[PDB]
Design a protein around this ligand. Structure first.
Ligand SMILES: NS(=O)(=O)c1ccc(NC(=O)NC2CCCC2)cc1
Ligand SMILES: [Zn+2]
Length: 257
């Protein structure tokens, strides 16, 4: 089954998931000079004050911090979006080295990691229905660079020892995802896909221009996770990113100039 190794990695995914070669695949390179400022883009509204985190799970591909999405508690609205999108989970992709790890790139620059806050359009009733719709999901992407520590990330880092291997979960209540945001909400946006199988073409991508900084020690702790289950051969969970895909017939729009 699929993963990020030599024999089951991104170059292989198209055999089980032909949409891998589709018309609106993610991630992409964001060519800053070619992106178009769109004055018609409304400001992003990130309303996370009532967020209810529940649990953190190592799923064998990344780790997800999951939220109660049975009411409008943590929502994303505005920007390119019509309607209300509920936060269901966030996770990251990261590298084995500080010079790689992000899925989106900016003028071909790779960041050390990339945070994805995954939201679904409430008009579709549940997440499983939403991923079957071209406007079903909105994922807020945030680049990580290595420098100073991100204080709001530390509670995540310190629970990772309890979910080292695939299938492990731990209680993770009262986490505030506002502590993971940069100062600016300036963004690029384009229509795309899930960046792992099943690669469904259901995402409005909103990628923030301003990265957050995390410390060497913080990212080193991500790299101690395992892709494998307990009692299976140890393979470090690193380089769990898909490279940039062809932009095809898409325009990336910018909220700023
Ligand atoms: N990296 S990402 O595009 O933000 C992403 C988000 C969610 C999932 N997967 C997920 O939500 N899977 C369920 C929906 C379809 C099958 C199960 C994969 C990639
Ligand atoms: Zn992701």
């Amino acid at each position: 089954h699929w993963g990020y190794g030599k024999h089951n990695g991104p170059e292989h995914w198209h055999k089980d998931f032909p949409i891998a070669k589709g018309e609106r695949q993610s991630p992409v390179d964001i060519d800053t000079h070619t992106a178009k400022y769109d004055p018609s883009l409304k400001p992003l509204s990130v309303s996370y004050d009532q967020a209810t985190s529940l649990r953190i799970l190592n799923n064998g591909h990344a780790f997800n911090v999951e939220f109660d999405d049975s009411q409008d508690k943590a929502v994303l609205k505005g920007g390119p979006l019509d309607g209300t999108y509920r936060l269901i989970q966030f996770h990251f992709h990261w590298g084995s080295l500080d010079g790689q790890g992000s899925e989106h790139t900016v003028d071909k620059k790779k960041y050390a990691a990339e945070l994805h806050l995954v939201h679904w359009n409430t008009k579709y009733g549940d997440f499983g229905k939403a991923v079957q719709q071209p406007d079903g999901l909105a994922v807020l992407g945030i680049f990580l660079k290595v420098g100073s520590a991100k204080p709001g990330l530390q509670k995540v880092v310190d629970v990772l020892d309890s979910i080292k291997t695939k299938g492990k979960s731990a209680d993770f209540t009262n986490f505030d995802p506002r502590g993971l945001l940069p100062e600016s909400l300036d963004y690029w946006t384009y229509p795309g896909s899930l960046t792992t199988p099943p690669l469904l073409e259901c995402v409005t991508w909103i990628v923030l221009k301003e990265p957050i900084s995390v410390s060497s020690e913080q990212v080193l702790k991500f790299r101690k996770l395992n892709f494998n289950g307990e009692g299976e051969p140890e393979e470090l969970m690193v380089d769990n990113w898909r490279p940039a895909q062809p932009l095809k017939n898409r325009q990336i729009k910018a909220s700023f100039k």
